[PDB]
């Protein structure tokens, strides 16, 4: 119970960082000092990733070259596909991603360290291939051949095309990218911290993404996006939205929907997502569940007056046709940009992260020959 | 308000309250659940030490026998896991392969999401039993050789050596390997253990936690050791060159691989183990070179003498240099599994804060402007 | 003689097992048996009832391998 | 020629590059190794190089054949 000890390293700074700023008291989230809202209105995930990773907005020549490098590296090796084919059909998709990222290491890990070329090659490879790999498990698990990357399509569209084999409406592709930019970086989140610890050892970059995938996968930091859709299924009609919440008002000690709420209130990402969803639904029509969600928001206002961005995200994904099991994985595709950016920073000044413990245990015990205890 | 303090690397910063391990340093003391490493090494199996760390009580015979039986049944690995390893590149780094293999193990298992105590025991048995088998498989598969099947008669250390070399180990060597495995099992909040704690705090599958930890141990700064030590011994090339070689390094260009200002208790046990193995199974030119380096080093050092020996013992046992970090993983899985259970009881998520050196309130700049 | 013949033919060829490995994990077992039985035909389909032996061989192989 | 290029891709884990009908013999081989169509003058130089090594009278390799 020492004052020095804080459970969960809460309020304890782990690094000095310039990549992102979040205030709980006030809505603001900034990437390299730029408001998320401005970037969302006028940015690409790839441009935002460059800003986060290299700290400067890209020149047109720089951006176009960066996109070209990703397009050439989008495809994945046959050996990687065969391994996924070896994967269990009912295997969890996030566990599959961790294995897939590590495997990429067996090939591209041979590395030049202290070489600037190395940081960019890994960033281009990881950003380009993690989306291709996620789509391939979805197709392979069903016995379906993986849909190859199409050079003509942009990063957001290719991911959607690889999952469905149907080119996305251009407007739909834009919303997905904005969603990707929204989930790219959120300060010292648990997934980023794991990546930073893996990085501290000076391990290869592909391993750091793999360690982060494992942490994102777990439910508390893990996407809880799937839960919102299931509850929405639980209320069959817009009618009964009011009844369902009240029975839930008695509750079994549970928090979801960004319940951890490191921001105390109003994550701004959520506000942008809700607008994005409404625009998408109006163009592409309104699903019955979506109306149920809108109703849930109206009930929330009585809850809102005193004191679910993930909840908004899942709905958007479904309209775009993303499978729910792939939702935590889509977050991984965006967070790779944040993860890579933290990796470069840890490298510039690196001390291995070795913490200390408070011992609550015994001392000076003597070994006992087995005797019944 | 008040001065704000930042320790780089969370150094000296407590992250958890644990009964699993104590290292004094200075006094040179390592204790697992209150028992000296020296006593455990002399009188305990890696598996017995593993029960003590994971469950916190030294086990009873009916418990040790059951635990050993459960490990033997789960020692074998699925064809799908072996086929996936065949897909792996031959030249691929062995530690990256361990990370992928453990993560894959989750796909078959992990269909529990269970608060059942059975779920924790099930993972402990599978992870401890399978990780040694998988490491052996990559070494054989990389050379195009079929993986050697586990032998029920053989114990855990012997089975690993048999799978790696295809030849039954001498009993004395197997005991030395088990003691080495017991020695590297737990060392408080290592970077690898901390990664396991942070992965486990999210409530992710245990197999994933091991995978994230294996990536952390893989890095050269922590858990990457050896190979370089032998690398140097091959380089000196003679007892005669040792006095000159050490001086050249001391004079300029720095030695490879300190946790504490006192000698690691583990190095003390390892050197005696090394001496016994070399005398019993034959000294090698490399061993003699090592002996010379240590005597020479002590007069200049009087020393990073810690855990260099492990490579020497492993080489004598015939473990390849590439697999040395992986051998450590087999032993430290027990500590990682133990921490996973302890983290689970309170399970606060790890969300540390940051100090912002960055700009604020900037505005997007159009690309055409540049 | 019958029991011994059944014991000898109990083992199944690697190519069929590889075929089962190609089969979906969630696939229904009875549908899987139908594919497996039909496959045994590709390896073993030869001869005529005129051979009394052919009837005996099928009886032993099918009883042993199914 | 297709086989030699195919090993080069397989060894590095890359899928083999299939022959393109439009390309001539020298160009397909270069395309198969690189995946980029060769400049024509270079394709001509490679074709001449192949002609130079095609026959050298009775030599260990021909004698074995
Ligand atoms: Mg973009
Ligand atoms: Mg923060
Ligand atoms: Mg700009
Ligand atoms: Mg000739």
Numbering used by the authors:
A (entry chain F): 3 to 309, 314 to 379
B (entry chain D): 2 to 255, 258 to 260, 263 to 307, 312 to 379
C (entry chain C): 67 to 132
D (entry chain B): 133 to 197
Mind quoting what the paper says about this structure?
Here we report the discovery of a natural protein, citrate synthase from the cyanobacterium Synechococcus elongatus, which self-assembles into Sierpiński triangles. Bacterial citrate synthase (CS) proteins are homo-oligomeric enzymes that can assemble into dimers and hexamers. CS catalyses the condensation of acetyl-CoA and oxaloacetate to citrate as the first step in the tricarboxylic acid cycle. Using cryo-electron microscopy, we reveal how the fractal assembles from a hexameric building block.
